[PDB]
Amino acid sequence: GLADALTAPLDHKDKGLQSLTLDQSVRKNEKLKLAAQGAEKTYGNGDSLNTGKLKNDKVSRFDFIRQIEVDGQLITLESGEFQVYKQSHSALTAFQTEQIQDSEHSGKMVAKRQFRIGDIAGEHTSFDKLPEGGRATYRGTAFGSDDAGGKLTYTIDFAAKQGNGKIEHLKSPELNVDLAAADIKPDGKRHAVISGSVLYNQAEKGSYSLGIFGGKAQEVAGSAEVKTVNGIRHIGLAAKQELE
């Protein structure tokens, strides 16, 4: 429902997450042009992405162009693929860079492949409204460059307010890491968050952060940044616990 996320107006009977705010996906004064399936739209820092139209628990793919206005003229800074993973109470965006602006000439694009996680948003679970007990396990997907086939497992102990998990099945072996035990903490707005280190074969190889989403802490969404021999790579993370 790509062309549709780009043109249709929020329909309220749409499966959530319905709306995603682009903040880390687009800087203050730049434009992001998304295209797909005979449609096209421009955003917009603070602008809303209609995720209601997209399929749940999958990666939606758009063509993207990032621009800036210099002297009443748009200059291309970067292009490639914009990735969107959607859950019910959360969603994240990612960028697969295929091209960036040449280092010496603004007006020339150069081939460069990079991957980063953009926005991480949704209906933030309040820290002060967490359960006090139990161990919720979460299952879902871990995606990196050229690979949305990774499997994520994460477990939260709400009494000890710690989380810990695992990444498996990503083609790149160095990305299959352990998300070490880490403390849940309150946000600046008191949203439940988690940040810890990453382990690969018992060695510290970076860090990870997760938000907790849903009235019932149904979901977790975030990112891992991992040190490889090539070296530092991002992994998008989205998991949810199974309902009844």
């Binding site: 800087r27 002297d71 040449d102 940040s195 860090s207 952060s209 990112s223 940044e225 530092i232």
Partner: protein, 123 residues
Amino acid sequence: TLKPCDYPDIKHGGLYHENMRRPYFPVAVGKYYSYYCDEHFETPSGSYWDHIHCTQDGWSPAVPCLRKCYFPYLENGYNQNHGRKFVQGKSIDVACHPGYALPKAQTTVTCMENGWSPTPRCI
């Protein structure tokens, strides 16, 4: 145990995922975080984002975001440098058409943190 690095204050930029990371400072040597630069600045990698690392000697790179100046078209000048990108600290000899010059008797322009000083124009 030592945790020398506090929340990195990045001029002309910032960390990604501020809300999730801020509550976990100070941090220990070896930790790193992805950051972005504002419009017109870039990281030492040539991208507008990279990673900043906690070292014994503080946050590295020491200067995470540098200005990039686009050299503008010169109405009444020679345009060998039209559309070129120059880094902060870079100086240029504006080559003006005969009968024309930089204003107020200037000869060169420099890419400053805030952009060209003075503005490269011819007449």
